[PDB]
Amino acid sequence: NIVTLTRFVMEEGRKARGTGEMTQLLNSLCTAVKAISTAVRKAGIAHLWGIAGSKKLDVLSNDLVINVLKSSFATCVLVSEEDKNAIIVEPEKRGKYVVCFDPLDGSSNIDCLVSIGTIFGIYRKNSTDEPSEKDALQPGRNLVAAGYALYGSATMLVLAMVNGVNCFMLDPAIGEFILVDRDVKIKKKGSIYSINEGYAKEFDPAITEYIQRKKFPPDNSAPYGARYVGSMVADVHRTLVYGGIFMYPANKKSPKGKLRLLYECNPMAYVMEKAGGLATTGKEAVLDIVPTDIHQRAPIILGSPEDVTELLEIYQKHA
Amino acid sequence: NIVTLTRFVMEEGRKARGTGEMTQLLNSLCTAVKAISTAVRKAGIAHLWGIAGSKKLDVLSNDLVINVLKSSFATCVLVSEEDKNAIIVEPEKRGKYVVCFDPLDGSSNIDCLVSIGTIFGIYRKNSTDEPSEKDALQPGRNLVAAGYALYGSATMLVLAMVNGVNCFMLDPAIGEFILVDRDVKIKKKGSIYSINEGYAKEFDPAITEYIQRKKFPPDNSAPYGARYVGSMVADVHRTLVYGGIFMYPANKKSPKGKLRLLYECNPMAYVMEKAGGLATTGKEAVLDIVPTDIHQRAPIILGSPEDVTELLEIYQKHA
Amino acid sequence: NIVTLTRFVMEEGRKARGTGEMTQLLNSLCTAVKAISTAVRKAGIAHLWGIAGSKKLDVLSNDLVINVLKSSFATCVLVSEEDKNAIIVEPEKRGKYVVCFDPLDGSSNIDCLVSIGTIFGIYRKNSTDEPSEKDALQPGRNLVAAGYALYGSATMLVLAMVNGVNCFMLDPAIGEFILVDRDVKIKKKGSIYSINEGYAKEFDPAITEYIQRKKFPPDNSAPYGARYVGSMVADVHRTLVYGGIFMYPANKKSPKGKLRLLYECNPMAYVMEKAGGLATTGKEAVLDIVPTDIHQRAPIILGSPEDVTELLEIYQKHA
Amino acid sequence: NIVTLTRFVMEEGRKARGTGEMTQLLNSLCTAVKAISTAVRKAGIAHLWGIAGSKKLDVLSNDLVINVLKSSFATCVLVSEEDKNAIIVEPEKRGKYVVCFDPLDGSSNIDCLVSIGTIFGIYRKNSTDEPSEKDALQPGRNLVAAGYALYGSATMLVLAMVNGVNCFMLDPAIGEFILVDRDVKIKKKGSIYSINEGYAKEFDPAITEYIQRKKFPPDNSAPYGARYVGSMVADVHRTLVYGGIFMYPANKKSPKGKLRLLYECNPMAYVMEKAGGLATTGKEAVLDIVPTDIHQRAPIILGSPEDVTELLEIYQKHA
Ligand SMILES: Nc1ncnc2c1ncn2[C@@H]1O[C@H](COP(=O)(O)O)[C@@H](O)[C@H]1O
Ligand SMILES: Nc1ncnc2c1ncn2[C@@H]1O[C@H](COP(=O)(O)O)[C@@H](O)[C@H]1O
Ligand SMILES: Nc1ncnc2c1ncn2[C@@H]1O[C@H](COP(=O)(O)O)[C@@H](O)[C@H]1O
Ligand SMILES: Nc1ncnc2c1ncn2[C@@H]1O[C@H](COP(=O)(O)O)[C@@H](O)[C@H]1O
Ligand SMILES: O=P(O)(O)OC[C@H]1O[C@](O)(CO)[C@@H](O)[C@@H]1O
Ligand SMILES: O=P(O)(O)OC[C@H]1O[C@](O)(CO)[C@@H](O)[C@@H]1O
Ligand SMILES: O=P(O)(O)OC[C@H]1O[C@](O)(CO)[C@@H](O)[C@@H]1O
Ligand SMILES: O=P(O)(O)OC[C@H]1O[C@](O)(CO)[C@@H](O)[C@@H]1O
Ligand SMILES: [Zn+2]
Ligand SMILES: [Zn+2]
Ligand SMILES: [Zn+2]
Ligand SMILES: [Zn+2]
Ligand SMILES: [Zn+2]
Ligand SMILES: [Zn+2]
Ligand SMILES: [Zn+2]
Ligand SMILES: [Zn+2]
C-alpha cells in the first residue's frame, strides 16, 4: 500500500473536514516543487545552448512559486525572499492563507552544483481587515504547515503539520512524491555539528565554548564530526535525519544573525519541533519571536534536543 | 555550436589518431554514468514501494561500471573500492586499459540526500606480461585520462586529459552531456577552506596553524569561508570552480590520511593539476607516489596554487 | 492560469460538494496512468537487458490499475479485461464506486510500437446488498465518469463527466497532466471513415453500402479518407478530435461484434455523447444496452452525428 | 551483453576502418533523434501554458536536424522536405556526406497524437565538383546507410547499412538506444495489407484486383487484416516487424503517387530490401530510379517478398 503525497494530503484534508482550500494549496505547492526540481536538474539545458540553432534559477523558481500559488485561489498574502514587499493576491483569486517562502535556498551553492531547495511556511489569515503585509507577521507558533523540498542527489519534500513530520521522495519517472518516512522524529543526541567556522573570530563566548567541546570533549568522549554543505535546506535535512546540531548564530559583523525569520528560520524551527527537536536563537525559541519586519533576520540553533540543550546551558553559563 | 561529450571524445580520438579503443571506453564510461545518475535521482522508486503490487546504490553503481567497462572490450584490469582484489577481464574482452574507479563516492552522505558521485582514473597497460594488479599500481603521473561525475543539484561530468579539463552538464531530457566550460583553469587563490575540523585534536602543527590563519588572517583580510559537504567529489568540484583549498590530512585512525590513492586522490590530483592547481600529501606530490597496494591511502591537500603553496610552506617551516 | 488535472478534479469535487471519495479515485487513476505511460515508453528498458549484469505490459498495466484503485479506498467492485470475474475489493478498503477498465487497449499493436492506451468507466454502486459482479452490470447511461489515456506520440488523458469532455496533455518532465482542450465537442460531420475493411466479405448490407458511398459518393462529393490504426483508443481519439466515424460492427464470424461492452464500448460511447457525438450498435444506442455478462461484446458505430446518422438511415433502409 | 547504438556504430566504423566522419554523423543523427522524441512527447509543455507566468514540431524537428548535421562536420549537402532548395554546408563545416531527410513524417497525424517519425538516407559525395543538389540526386542503390526513428508507444530507431537492419529501442531514462533486434529479416509472407482505400475510385486495375483478392481469397484462406495508421513511418515499421504489404500507388491528385522519393521512398526501400523485402513502383525498383528533382514523387509498394511479387505479377498480367 504505497502512499503518494497527493493521496496523503487529501486524506489529511478529509480527516480534518477542511473545505478543500488548503488541500488545493498543498497540491499546487507540490506541483511547483516538481517544476523547480526539473529546472534544477537542467532538463532541456541542451536547447539553451542552441541545440536547434538560434532565466536564472533564482528568478525562475520565484516566478513558478508565485504563479502556482496565485492559481490555487487559496492565498491572500505571499511573502517571498525575492520581493521587497509582501505580495497581495488579486481579490478574485484570494484564499484565506498566507505563505512565506524561500524559492531557492543556498544561492552560493548554485553554481557549484551543491544541494539547494525550497522552504515554505503556511499561515491562516488571523484577522478580518484587508490583506496587508502584516498578515505575514505572525510568529511561527501560528503555522498551520511548514516544510521544504531538497534538491540533492534525489529530490525530497519534507512536510510538517500539527500531526507531525513526513518525508516524501520524488520519483521523477512518474512525477510522484512517495511517502518513505512517516511521523519522523529526530534522535535525542547526535554526533555532528554544522556551522561555518569561518567566522570564528566573531563568535560569542557560548558558540566558541560549544565548538571547543565538540573537538576536545571534557569527558574525553569521541569528538563530533563536522559537516557544512553551505545550504540551509541540506544542512538542516541532514540534521533531521542523522541527528546532531545546525548553527547560524549572530556575530560582530552580523548582530542579528544572517538567516531570515519568516521563510527560513520559522519553517525549519517548526519542522524541528514537530520532529521532537529544538530551535532557539540562544535565549528565546524561534517559533515564539514576534516578527517586526518581513525580511527580519534571526540567529538560529537547531537539531537534537540534547545537543541544543547543551548549548542553551552554556549560554546561561555566560548569562 | 552545441558540443556533446560524445562528439567531444570522438573528435579528440581523431586528432590523436587512436584506433578507437579509448574512445569506446570513454563512451562506455559516459553510459555507465547516466545509468547511475538516473538511479541516484530515484527514478522508478515507486515500484519499490509496490505501486504495482510489489539492492543498495553502492553495489548497483559498482555492478554497472564493471559490466559497462568489461563490455567496452577496452580494459584488461579493473580496480574498485568495492572489491578486495583487482579484477582481470576475460581474454575475449581484453583491451589495453587499466581503470581505477570509485563507483559511488560519499557513502556517509547517501541517506541524507547530499551530493555524491563517481571518480575514475585511466592508465594504459605498461607491460607485455599477463594482466594483474601490478598494471594498476602506476603513479598518477601516468594517467591518460581522469575525472568524476557529480550528482548534485544537477549531474555534471568533469573530464581531464593531457590537453586540459572540460566540464559537461548532463541534460537528462535527451541523455547527453553538454560542454559548458572549456579548458577550465582554477583561480590562483580562493577564499574557501574545506576540511572536517572535528579532527582538530588530531591535526599536526601545520594544518592547525593554517586553519587558524584562515580564521584570523595576519594581514587582517576577510577570513576565508568554511565549506565541507562530506563528499570528496562535491568539495573538490566546488574547489575547482570557485577556487580555494580542500584538505584531508592524517589523524589517529588514519595516520596516512583516509582517502584512497588509486581511485580518489590520484584522479582528483590529475584534474586539479591539469587545471593549474596543486595536490600534495603535505610532503610530496600525490601524482608521483608509486603505490604498492591498490587500496593504499594517502593524505591530500589540493586546490588553488597560492593557497596550497602557503600551506606547503607551513609544512617546510616546521620541518 | 494553467490548469493541472489534479486541480481540475479537486475543483469539480468541491463544486459538487463531494465527500472527496471520487476525487481520490480520479487522482489514483491519473497516477496509475502516468505509471503505465512510463512503462510503455520503455523507461528503464536498458536494465532489463542486464545493463548492470545479471513482466509483459498487459500484465503490468493490469497490476498497476488493480493495486492503485484498491488503495484509493473508493471502489468496491472492479472489472478488468484481464480477469475472468469481477474483483471484489476487501471490506477494509471499500468505497462506493465500481470501475470497469481496459488496462491496455490495442494488444496487437503492442509489438509494432503503434499507439495503445487505457480505457475506464466509473459507476456508483446502485444497491445496498453485498458487492458482487452484478454491480458492474449497469448500462453506460449510469456512468458517473468515463475516459481514456492515449499513449501515442504524446500521452493524453481524456476525461468525460456529466459536465462534459476535457483533454489533458501529460508533461513527462513534471508528471503533470495539463488541460489543453476544455469542453470538447466533436464536429457535426467529418471526412474520415475508420474500419477494418479486411472483413469485407462478412459485413452486413448496411456497412457494405456505407463504405461504398465513402469511396464513390452518389452526390459526387470528395471521397472520405481512410484511417485504421488498429487500436480502439487511437482510432476513437482521432475521431473525437478530427471528426468522422469509427466502426467495429458484427459479421458472420463474429455475430455480436468484437469489442467488449463494459470497458471499451460504454466508455467510448459516453465520451462521444458528451462531446456531442453518437454511438450506436446499428439499432440501439450503446449506453442504453442492458449488460448481461461482464465480458459481453457489442457492435459499435461512433463519431460525428451526421456521419453516424447517415449510417443509421442505411440500416433502416435494409430494415 | 548490452549494446547501445553508440557502441554499435563505433564498432562498425572500426571494422570498416573509417576515418570517423560517418561515425560522428550517425552519432549526431542519434542525438538529433533523442531531441525530437523529447519534444514530441511534450516534455516541458507546462511552460507553454505559462506554469511560471508565461514553434510547431515540424519547424523545430527540421531546425534540430539541420543544426545537428551541420555541426557534425561530416556533411556538404542536405535535402529536407521542409526546404524548397537543397542546403549546401559552409566550407568550414563540410564533410563528404549527403543527407536526405524527412524531419517529421506523418503531418496529418500530428494533432491527433498518432505515431510519427523521422526518415533519413545517407550518400557519399560522388564527384570532386563543388557541392550542389546534383550530389543529392543519386539512386537509392547508392545509399551507405538509411533508416528511421519511430515515435510511437515508445521511440525506436531502425538503421540499415550494407551489412543489414538493426532496431534500437530508446531507453529515455538514460538517453541510450538499446539493440533489441539484430540483423532483422521480414517474413516471406504476411497477413496484413496497408493502404488508404479512400482512393478506391482512383486506383488502377492491378491495385483494385489485389485488394479484392486480399478480402476474398481465391484459395479461400482467411482474409488479410487491414491496417493504416496514416504515417508512413508507422505503417512501414509494422510491415517490417509483422510482415505483410504497404502501398501508396498513384491517384488523381498524385499520378506519380504522393510520397517523396529522396527522403521517404528510398530510405524505406533500402531498409526493406536489406531485410529481405521488396519495394517497387509497380513497374520498377524504387532504389534504381535516378531522380532529377530533389522533391520528386514516386509510387511505392513494399513489404514481404511473396506479397509484393504477387502484386507485381498482377501488374504484368494486365500489361
Ligand atoms: N489537507 C489538509 N491537511 C491538513 N490539515 C488540513 C487539510 N485541509 C484542511 N486542514 C485543516 O483544516 C483547516 C481549514 O481548512 P480549509 O477549509 O481547507 O482552509 C486548515 O487550516 C487545517 O488546520
Ligand atoms: N578520445 C580520445 N581522447 C584523447 N586522447 C585519445 C583518445 N583516443 C585515443 N587517444 C590517445 O591515443 C592513445 C591510443 O588510443 P587507442 O588507439 O584508442 O588505444 C590513447 O592512449 C591516448 O593517448
Ligand atoms: N471530483 C469530482 N468531479 C466530479 N464530480 C464529482 C467529484 N467528486 C464528487 N462528484 C460528484 O459527487 C458524487 C458523490 O461524490 P463522493 O462523495 O466523492 O462519492 C459523485 O458521484 C459525483 O457525481
Ligand atoms: N560507423 C560505420 N558503420 C558502417 N560503415 C562505416 C562506418 N564508418 C565508416 N563506414 C564505411 O566506411 C566508409 C568511409 O567512412 P569515413 O572514413 O568515416 O568517411 C563509409 O562510407 C562506410 O562505407
Ligand atoms: O556562507 P554562509 O554565511 O555560511 O551562508 C550559509 C547560509 O546562507 C544561505 O545560503 C542563506 O539562505 C543558507 O542557505 C546557508 O545556511
Ligand atoms: O567523515 P569524514 O572523516 O570527514 O570523511 C569524509 C570523506 O570520506 C569520503 O566519504 C570517502 O571515504 C569522502 O568522499 C569524504 O571527503
Ligand atoms: O484486428 P481487428 O479485428 O480490427 O481488431 C481491432 C480492435 O481490436 C482491439 O485491439 C481490441 O480491443 C481494439 O483496440 C481495436 O479496435
Ligand atoms: O492521407 P493519405 O493520402 O493516406 O497520405 C498519408 C501519407 O502521407 C504521409 O503523411 C506523407 O505525406 C505519409 O506519412 C502517409 O503514408
Ligand atoms: Zn535561503
Ligand atoms: Zn533564497
Ligand atoms: Zn570515495
Ligand atoms: Zn566509494
Ligand atoms: Zn481494448
Ligand atoms: Zn486490453
Ligand atoms: Zn514524410
Ligand atoms: Zn515530413
PDB file of all heavy atoms in Angstrom, chain C residues 2 41 44 46 108 113 153 171 196 226 228 242, chain D residues 41 44 46 49 108 113 153 171 196 226 228 242:
ATOM      1  N   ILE C   2      -2.695  28.237 -15.792  1.00  0.00           N
ATOM      2  CA  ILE C   2      -2.635  26.853 -16.260  1.00  0.00           C
ATOM      3  C   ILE C   2      -3.350  25.892 -15.304  1.00  0.00           C
ATOM      4  O   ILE C   2      -3.211  25.993 -14.087  1.00  0.00           O
ATOM      5  CB  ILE C   2      -1.165  26.415 -16.444  1.00  0.00           C
ATOM      6  CG1 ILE C   2      -1.102  25.061 -17.144  1.00  0.00           C
ATOM      7  CG2 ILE C   2      -0.466  26.353 -15.097  1.00  0.00           C
ATOM      8  CD1 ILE C   2       0.310  24.626 -17.475  1.00  0.00           C
ATOM      9  N   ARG C  41       6.654   3.737 -22.596  1.00  0.00           N
ATOM     10  CA  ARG C  41       7.750   4.396 -23.299  1.00  0.00           C
ATOM     11  C   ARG C  41       9.090   3.673 -23.124  1.00  0.00           C
ATOM     12  O   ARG C  41      10.108   4.116 -23.639  1.00  0.00           O
ATOM     13  CB  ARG C  41       7.888   5.854 -22.847  1.00  0.00           C
ATOM     14  CG  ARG C  41       6.932   6.833 -23.532  1.00  0.00           C
ATOM     15  CD  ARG C  41       5.484   6.571 -23.139  1.00  0.00           C
ATOM     16  NE  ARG C  41       4.593   7.651 -23.551  1.00  0.00           N
ATOM     17  CZ  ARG C  41       4.071   7.784 -24.770  1.00  0.00           C
ATOM     18  NH1 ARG C  41       4.343   6.900 -25.726  1.00  0.00           N
ATOM     19  NH2 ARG C  41       3.265   8.811 -25.029  1.00  0.00           N
ATOM     20  N   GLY C  44      13.849   2.657 -18.461  1.00  0.00           N
ATOM     21  CA  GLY C  44      14.498   1.610 -17.692  1.00  0.00           C
ATOM     22  C   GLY C  44      14.578   0.277 -18.419  1.00  0.00           C
ATOM     23  O   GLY C  44      14.813  -0.759 -17.800  1.00  0.00           O
ATOM     24  N   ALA C  46      16.860  -0.543 -20.508  1.00  0.00           N
ATOM     25  CA  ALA C  46      18.273  -0.904 -20.565  1.00  0.00           C
ATOM     26  C   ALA C  46      18.642  -1.851 -19.429  1.00  0.00           C
ATOM     27  O   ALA C  46      19.475  -2.741 -19.599  1.00  0.00           O
ATOM     28  CB  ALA C  46      19.139   0.352 -20.499  1.00  0.00           C
ATOM     29  N   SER C 108      -2.648  -6.080 -30.243  1.00  0.00           N
ATOM     30  CA  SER C 108      -1.966  -6.426 -31.491  1.00  0.00           C
ATOM     31  C   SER C 108      -0.991  -5.352 -31.967  1.00  0.00           C
ATOM     32  O   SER C 108      -0.119  -5.622 -32.794  1.00  0.00           O
ATOM     33  CB  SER C 108      -2.981  -6.710 -32.607  1.00  0.00           C
ATOM     34  OG  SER C 108      -3.695  -5.541 -32.969  1.00  0.00           O
ATOM     35  N   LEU C 113       4.936  -1.157 -31.806  1.00  0.00           N
ATOM     36  CA  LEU C 113       5.057   0.179 -31.218  1.00  0.00           C
ATOM     37  C   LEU C 113       4.016   1.214 -31.624  1.00  0.00           C
ATOM     38  O   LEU C 113       4.229   2.415 -31.459  1.00  0.00           O
ATOM     39  CB  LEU C 113       6.458   0.738 -31.480  1.00  0.00           C
ATOM     40  CG  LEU C 113       7.600  -0.152 -30.976  1.00  0.00           C
ATOM     41  CD1 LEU C 113       8.936   0.537 -31.206  1.00  0.00           C
ATOM     42  CD2 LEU C 113       7.396  -0.462 -29.496  1.00  0.00           C
ATOM     43  N   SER C 153       2.110   9.617 -29.777  1.00  0.00           N
ATOM     44  CA  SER C 153       3.342  10.393 -29.911  1.00  0.00           C
ATOM     45  C   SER C 153       3.583  11.109 -28.581  1.00  0.00           C
ATOM     46  O   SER C 153       4.725  11.387 -28.186  1.00  0.00           O
ATOM     47  CB  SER C 153       3.201  11.406 -31.045  1.00  0.00           C
ATOM     48  OG  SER C 153       2.058  12.220 -30.851  1.00  0.00           O
ATOM     49  N   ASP C 171       2.776  16.179 -19.245  1.00  0.00           N
ATOM     50  CA  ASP C 171       4.100  16.781 -19.363  1.00  0.00           C
ATOM     51  C   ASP C 171       4.990  15.846 -18.546  1.00  0.00           C
ATOM     52  O   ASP C 171       5.055  15.954 -17.321  1.00  0.00           O
ATOM     53  CB  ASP C 171       4.109  18.176 -18.745  1.00  0.00           C
ATOM     54  CG  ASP C 171       5.439  18.880 -18.918  1.00  0.00           C
ATOM     55  OD1 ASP C 171       6.484  18.200 -18.966  1.00  0.00           O
ATOM     56  OD2 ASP C 171       5.440  20.123 -18.992  1.00  0.00           O
ATOM     57  N   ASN C 196     -11.897  -1.831 -40.176  1.00  0.00           N
ATOM     58  CA  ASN C 196     -11.029  -2.874 -40.721  1.00  0.00           C
ATOM     59  C   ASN C 196     -11.742  -3.463 -41.937  1.00  0.00           C
ATOM     60  O   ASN C 196     -12.608  -4.335 -41.813  1.00  0.00           O
ATOM     61  CB  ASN C 196     -10.781  -3.977 -39.685  1.00  0.00           C
ATOM     62  CG  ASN C 196      -9.679  -4.948 -40.109  1.00  0.00           C
ATOM     63  OD1 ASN C 196      -9.432  -5.152 -41.305  1.00  0.00           O
ATOM     64  ND2 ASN C 196      -9.021  -5.561 -39.126  1.00  0.00           N
ATOM     65  N   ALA C 226      -9.382   7.250 -45.503  1.00  0.00           N
ATOM     66  CA  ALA C 226      -9.422   6.055 -44.674  1.00  0.00           C
ATOM     67  C   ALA C 226      -8.292   6.055 -43.651  1.00  0.00           C
ATOM     68  O   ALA C 226      -7.160   6.430 -43.961  1.00  0.00           O
ATOM     69  CB  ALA C 226      -9.331   4.819 -45.549  1.00  0.00           C
ATOM     70  N   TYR C 228      -7.049   3.535 -40.146  1.00  0.00           N
ATOM     71  CA  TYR C 228      -7.284   2.447 -39.203  1.00  0.00           C
ATOM     72  C   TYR C 228      -5.979   2.102 -38.489  1.00  0.00           C
ATOM     73  O   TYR C 228      -5.166   1.320 -38.984  1.00  0.00           O
ATOM     74  CB  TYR C 228      -7.833   1.197 -39.909  1.00  0.00           C
ATOM     75  CG  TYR C 228      -8.510   0.211 -38.968  1.00  0.00           C
ATOM     76  CD1 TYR C 228      -9.722   0.528 -38.356  1.00  0.00           C
ATOM     77  CD2 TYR C 228      -7.943  -1.036 -38.693  1.00  0.00           C
ATOM     78  CE1 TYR C 228     -10.359  -0.373 -37.493  1.00  0.00           C
ATOM     79  CE2 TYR C 228      -8.575  -1.949 -37.822  1.00  0.00           C
ATOM     80  CZ  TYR C 228      -9.782  -1.606 -37.229  1.00  0.00           C
ATOM     81  OH  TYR C 228     -10.417  -2.478 -36.362  1.00  0.00           O
ATOM     82  N   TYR C 242     -10.710  15.009 -34.834  1.00  0.00           N
ATOM     83  CA  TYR C 242     -10.756  15.364 -36.250  1.00  0.00           C
ATOM     84  C   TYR C 242     -12.159  15.202 -36.823  1.00  0.00           C
ATOM     85  O   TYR C 242     -12.479  15.768 -37.873  1.00  0.00           O
ATOM     86  CB  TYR C 242      -9.806  14.481 -37.057  1.00  0.00           C
ATOM     87  CG  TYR C 242      -8.338  14.797 -36.909  1.00  0.00           C
ATOM     88  CD1 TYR C 242      -7.889  15.762 -36.008  1.00  0.00           C
ATOM     89  CD2 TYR C 242      -7.395  14.136 -37.691  1.00  0.00           C
ATOM     90  CE1 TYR C 242      -6.534  16.061 -35.896  1.00  0.00           C
ATOM     91  CE2 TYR C 242      -6.046  14.424 -37.590  1.00  0.00           C
ATOM     92  CZ  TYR C 242      -5.617  15.385 -36.696  1.00  0.00           C
ATOM     93  OH  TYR C 242      -4.270  15.664 -36.610  1.00  0.00           O
TER      94      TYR C 242
ATOM     95  N   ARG D  41       7.122  13.995 -27.268  1.00  0.00           N
ATOM     96  CA  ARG D  41       6.469  13.505 -26.059  1.00  0.00           C
ATOM     97  C   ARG D  41       5.890  14.624 -25.179  1.00  0.00           C
ATOM     98  O   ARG D  41       5.301  14.352 -24.136  1.00  0.00           O
ATOM     99  CB  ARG D  41       7.442  12.650 -25.237  1.00  0.00           C
ATOM    100  CG  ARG D  41       7.522  11.168 -25.635  1.00  0.00           C
ATOM    101  CD  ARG D  41       8.105  10.942 -27.018  1.00  0.00           C
ATOM    102  NE  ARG D  41       8.380   9.525 -27.263  1.00  0.00           N
ATOM    103  CZ  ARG D  41       7.514   8.656 -27.787  1.00  0.00           C
ATOM    104  NH1 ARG D  41       6.291   9.041 -28.141  1.00  0.00           N
ATOM    105  NH2 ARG D  41       7.876   7.391 -27.960  1.00  0.00           N
ATOM    106  N   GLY D  44       8.114  19.501 -20.940  1.00  0.00           N
ATOM    107  CA  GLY D  44       8.244  20.944 -20.812  1.00  0.00           C
ATOM    108  C   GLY D  44       7.066  21.735 -21.343  1.00  0.00           C
ATOM    109  O   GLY D  44       7.074  22.962 -21.331  1.00  0.00           O
ATOM    110  N   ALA D  46       4.425  22.387 -20.039  1.00  0.00           N
ATOM    111  CA  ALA D  46       3.807  23.195 -18.984  1.00  0.00           C
ATOM    112  C   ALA D  46       4.230  24.659 -19.069  1.00  0.00           C
ATOM    113  O   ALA D  46       3.463  25.550 -18.705  1.00  0.00           O
ATOM    114  CB  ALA D  46       4.159  22.632 -17.614  1.00  0.00           C
ATOM    115  N   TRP D  49       1.806  26.711 -21.376  1.00  0.00           N
ATOM    116  CA  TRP D  49       0.609  27.259 -20.751  1.00  0.00           C
ATOM    117  C   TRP D  49       0.977  28.055 -19.505  1.00  0.00           C
ATOM    118  O   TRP D  49       0.278  28.007 -18.492  1.00  0.00           O
ATOM    119  CB  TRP D  49      -0.369  26.133 -20.399  1.00  0.00           C
ATOM    120  CG  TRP D  49      -1.274  25.781 -21.539  1.00  0.00           C
ATOM    121  CD1 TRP D  49      -2.571  26.178 -21.712  1.00  0.00           C
ATOM    122  CD2 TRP D  49      -0.923  25.035 -22.711  1.00  0.00           C
ATOM    123  NE1 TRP D  49      -3.048  25.728 -22.922  1.00  0.00           N
ATOM    124  CE2 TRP D  49      -2.057  25.026 -23.556  1.00  0.00           C
ATOM    125  CE3 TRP D  49       0.242  24.377 -23.131  1.00  0.00           C
ATOM    126  CZ2 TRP D  49      -2.061  24.383 -24.797  1.00  0.00           C
ATOM    127  CZ3 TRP D  49       0.238  23.739 -24.368  1.00  0.00           C
ATOM    128  CH2 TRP D  49      -0.907  23.747 -25.186  1.00  0.00           C
ATOM    129  N   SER D 108      -0.325  14.747 -40.996  1.00  0.00           N
ATOM    130  CA  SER D 108      -1.761  14.704 -40.726  1.00  0.00           C
ATOM    131  C   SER D 108      -2.086  14.059 -39.383  1.00  0.00           C
ATOM    132  O   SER D 108      -3.178  14.256 -38.842  1.00  0.00           O
ATOM    133  CB  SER D 108      -2.504  13.958 -41.841  1.00  0.00           C
ATOM    134  OG  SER D 108      -2.352  12.549 -41.725  1.00  0.00           O
ATOM    135  N   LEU D 113      -2.371  12.968 -32.079  1.00  0.00           N
ATOM    136  CA  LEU D 113      -1.433  12.193 -31.263  1.00  0.00           C
ATOM    137  C   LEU D 113      -1.033  10.807 -31.760  1.00  0.00           C
ATOM    138  O   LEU D 113      -0.549   9.982 -30.981  1.00  0.00           O
ATOM    139  CB  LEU D 113      -1.954  12.097 -29.820  1.00  0.00           C
ATOM    140  CG  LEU D 113      -2.165  13.477 -29.187  1.00  0.00           C
ATOM    141  CD1 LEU D 113      -2.476  13.339 -27.711  1.00  0.00           C
ATOM    142  CD2 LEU D 113      -0.901  14.331 -29.391  1.00  0.00           C
ATOM    143  N   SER D 153       4.349   4.194 -29.330  1.00  0.00           N
ATOM    144  CA  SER D 153       4.108   3.927 -27.915  1.00  0.00           C
ATOM    145  C   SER D 153       5.445   4.138 -27.194  1.00  0.00           C
ATOM    146  O   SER D 153       5.497   4.578 -26.041  1.00  0.00           O
ATOM    147  CB  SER D 153       3.591   2.495 -27.726  1.00  0.00           C
ATOM    148  OG  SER D 153       4.433   1.544 -28.360  1.00  0.00           O
ATOM    149  N   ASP D 171      15.814   4.016 -24.472  1.00  0.00           N
ATOM    150  CA  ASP D 171      15.513   3.980 -23.049  1.00  0.00           C
ATOM    151  C   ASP D 171      15.656   5.450 -22.655  1.00  0.00           C
ATOM    152  O   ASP D 171      16.770   5.942 -22.476  1.00  0.00           O
ATOM    153  CB  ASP D 171      16.544   3.142 -22.302  1.00  0.00           C
ATOM    154  CG  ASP D 171      16.257   3.056 -20.814  1.00  0.00           C
ATOM    155  OD1 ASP D 171      15.428   3.847 -20.314  1.00  0.00           O
ATOM    156  OD2 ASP D 171      16.870   2.198 -20.144  1.00  0.00           O
ATOM    157  N   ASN D 196      -4.608   3.388 -48.108  1.00  0.00           N
ATOM    158  CA  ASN D 196      -5.768   4.248 -47.883  1.00  0.00           C
ATOM    159  C   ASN D 196      -6.783   3.892 -48.980  1.00  0.00           C
ATOM    160  O   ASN D 196      -6.618   4.268 -50.146  1.00  0.00           O
ATOM    161  CB  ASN D 196      -5.360   5.724 -47.983  1.00  0.00           C
ATOM    162  CG  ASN D 196      -6.481   6.674 -47.570  1.00  0.00           C
ATOM    163  OD1 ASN D 196      -7.626   6.259 -47.391  1.00  0.00           O
ATOM    164  ND2 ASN D 196      -6.153   7.962 -47.424  1.00  0.00           N
ATOM    165  N   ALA D 226      -6.665  -5.511 -42.144  1.00  0.00           N
ATOM    166  CA  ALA D 226      -6.358  -4.178 -42.657  1.00  0.00           C
ATOM    167  C   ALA D 226      -5.775  -3.285 -41.564  1.00  0.00           C
ATOM    168  O   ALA D 226      -6.176  -3.367 -40.404  1.00  0.00           O
ATOM    169  CB  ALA D 226      -7.607  -3.540 -43.242  1.00  0.00           C
ATOM    170  N   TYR D 228      -3.893   0.875 -41.358  1.00  0.00           N
ATOM    171  CA  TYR D 228      -3.383   2.076 -41.999  1.00  0.00           C
ATOM    172  C   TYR D 228      -3.373   3.190 -40.961  1.00  0.00           C
ATOM    173  O   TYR D 228      -4.391   3.843 -40.707  1.00  0.00           O
ATOM    174  CB  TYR D 228      -4.249   2.478 -43.195  1.00  0.00           C
ATOM    175  CG  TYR D 228      -3.565   3.454 -44.148  1.00  0.00           C
ATOM    176  CD1 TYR D 228      -2.480   3.054 -44.930  1.00  0.00           C
ATOM    177  CD2 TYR D 228      -4.019   4.769 -44.282  1.00  0.00           C
ATOM    178  CE1 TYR D 228      -1.867   3.938 -45.825  1.00  0.00           C
ATOM    179  CE2 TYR D 228      -3.414   5.657 -45.169  1.00  0.00           C
ATOM    180  CZ  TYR D 228      -2.342   5.237 -45.942  1.00  0.00           C
ATOM    181  OH  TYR D 228      -1.763   6.105 -46.850  1.00  0.00           O
ATOM    182  N   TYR D 242       6.051  -7.256 -38.501  1.00  0.00           N
ATOM    183  CA  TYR D 242       4.969  -8.249 -38.558  1.00  0.00           C
ATOM    184  C   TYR D 242       4.852  -8.923 -39.921  1.00  0.00           C
ATOM    185  O   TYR D 242       4.269  -9.999 -40.029  1.00  0.00           O
ATOM    186  CB  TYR D 242       3.609  -7.607 -38.268  1.00  0.00           C
ATOM    187  CG  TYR D 242       3.342  -7.209 -36.837  1.00  0.00           C
ATOM    188  CD1 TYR D 242       4.284  -7.434 -35.830  1.00  0.00           C
ATOM    189  CD2 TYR D 242       2.120  -6.624 -36.485  1.00  0.00           C
ATOM    190  CE1 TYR D 242       4.012  -7.087 -34.502  1.00  0.00           C
ATOM    191  CE2 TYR D 242       1.840  -6.275 -35.168  1.00  0.00           C
ATOM    192  CZ  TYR D 242       2.787  -6.508 -34.181  1.00  0.00           C
ATOM    193  OH  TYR D 242       2.505  -6.163 -32.879  1.00  0.00           O
TER     194      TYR D 242
END
